[model samples]
Target: SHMIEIQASQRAYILEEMAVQLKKKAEERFSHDEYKVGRIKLTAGEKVDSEEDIKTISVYMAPSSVAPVHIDTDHAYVTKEAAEQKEAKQIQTQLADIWEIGSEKITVHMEGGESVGNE
Candidate 1:
């Protein structure tokens, strides 16, 4: 007769599902040889034991998104791709809201897949 939410297991499953969506969606623009996805996050604070740890649920926009890259998915994808970073914010930014809401805050690292050697 009450509202009991945030089932840990369910959350994990849904979060992972959301991540899969992000991975699938974010890998459409480039080929597997162009860019790929990486789901990673920090160790969470307050949740961190001491004041000597590091963490965050925020999108860990890779301080490094290099590319010798690759990508693979069902549809719609792209990232930093700096050299020709034509990836519309609509792709990452837009859906991020979806994932952020869905994945308990999804943080996909598109590193080592930023710009590919397309030539």
Candidate 2:
């Protein structure tokens, strides 16, 4: 049990470090091309009953103007500049909505894991 805990801690540290590095890269890209990073989603393959049982850790970044979107979307009908502006507007609207709900009660589920935040 001790060894399993140690392995899980190590894995979590590595994952967080990788995420930080990737976020830095994303920021650099944003500086160069006005691209921004959105939410990051992670998936682990199978139940991690043991350290050795951990199969895969997949990381995914959600959509943004810099990311790909559906070709059939309304944005696709406009010019590239127009599409970018529209997407940015949409992101701003969504963020505004969230901000407007500030201090509201919200339910957050971490499931079988824990949450980490910056110091």
Best by lDDT: 1
TM-score of every prediction relative to native: 0.31, 0.31
Candidate 1: segments with Cα more than 4 A from true spot: 1-8, 40-119
Per-residue lDDT over 1-119 for candidate 1, one digit per residue giving the tens place of the 0 to 100 score: 88757556643554555445545655453324333344443343333333222333333233223456856453434323332344423334544554343332333443433432111
lDDT of each: 0.40, 0.38
**Mind giving the per-residue lDDT tens digits that candidate 2 earns over 1-119?**
45533455655665556456644654554444433444433333444343233332222223333546646556665665465445544434433254242212112222222221111
Cα TM-score of candidate 1: 0.31
Candidate 2 worst ten-residue window by lDDT: 102-111
Model 2 / residue 67 / CA error / Å: 24
Candidate 2 local Cα displacement, residue 41, angstroms:
2.8
